Amino acid sequence: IGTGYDLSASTFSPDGRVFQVEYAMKAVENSSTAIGIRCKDGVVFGVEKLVLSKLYEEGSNKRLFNVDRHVGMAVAGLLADARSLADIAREEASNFRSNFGYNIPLKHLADRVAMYVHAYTLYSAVRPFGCSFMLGSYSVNDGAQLYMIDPSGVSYGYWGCAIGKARQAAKTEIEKLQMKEMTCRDIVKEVAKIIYIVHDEVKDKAFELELSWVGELTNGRHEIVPKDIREEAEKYAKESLK
């Protein structure tokens, strides 16, 4: 109960809480589920993308962006805020490369974007962001890395993450994987299977699977999964459902 102290981002509840940030975090659970799994030699993403109508193209309103040559990104929540944060991340990476002449480390980029997100929960002239996102990268001298940022502005490193409406079941399914000793080719199928298991068809008419990895196979580049591998993963997931 925080009635009366929840109309601005610069007001403290009598027990020391800010409720606008809590409402913003609650707003993320209104969208579909996106997961990301870090493995021995790469990072692979997967998004359950709902279909609104058949009048839209194949690549409309995607949820997987290319922040840089070596960094991927997956979002959840309000889409416009996701586009704005993607633009911010691109600008930060470009500025670092221009200043210092080499690719920006993932931890530094995560810190920059997390601080930019946190700056919005301090003043009464703006409102907190309403989206979470994950970042993934790979390099020969550092290895795979994965991070999450939430509307409050807190970032952490993960071995496997899940954001959206059904993060609990997705986390339960992920916690049964030995991702430390497998390979991206063996993780794409698991990601597809988890996405298919989590999806609920009663309240959601249809969906399209979206996948992309980064790692040693792509030579340190973030790319979309080829169509044949997507088809094979979908077929395996459908067979495993039975």
């Binding site: 290319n66 840089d68 040559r69 691109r90 470009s94 221009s98």
Partner: protein, 198 residues
Amino acid sequence: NPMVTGTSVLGVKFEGGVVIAADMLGSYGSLARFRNISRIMRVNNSTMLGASGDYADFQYLKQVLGQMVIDEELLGDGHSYSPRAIHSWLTRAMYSRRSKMNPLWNTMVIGGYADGESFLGYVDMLGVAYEAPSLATGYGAYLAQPLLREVLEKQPVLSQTEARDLVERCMRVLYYRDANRFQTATVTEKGVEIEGPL
């Protein structure tokens, strides 16, 4: 305040693309000790750039142009900069900098091969731009332009080997004028290939 000339840059057009040769020498003034530096840039798969003049401005423009190319290829919507777009952007940048009496001391040559047609442009620090079958800027600008012009006038259509031989002999004549190393770049359907130093 004192002024000195710049290194020589050559360029010709042949059937499949363009050939550009540049000098490896640092500068003709007191900076002669900075030898063995490259002046040829690869912009994208169908554009290459050669420079003659100040080196710091060349590096600055290299940074800006590379960042722009990376930014456009990140989106992946299927659109890329043509050689003419780079030519126009360079001309506008030079003119805008000149109008403020803080010019960029350079003289660029742009070559490319898009849509089956070759390109060859010229931009200087004052904003003067045009296109010609052959170009030559630098120390021997007036001793090499008429030669290439008449050679191309005799034969409007030239092959790759003939153009390369003509460039080599022009560079040899220029060195014989005053007494070492250079490099050559080519743009064709395959892409931008740089060979050097020689």
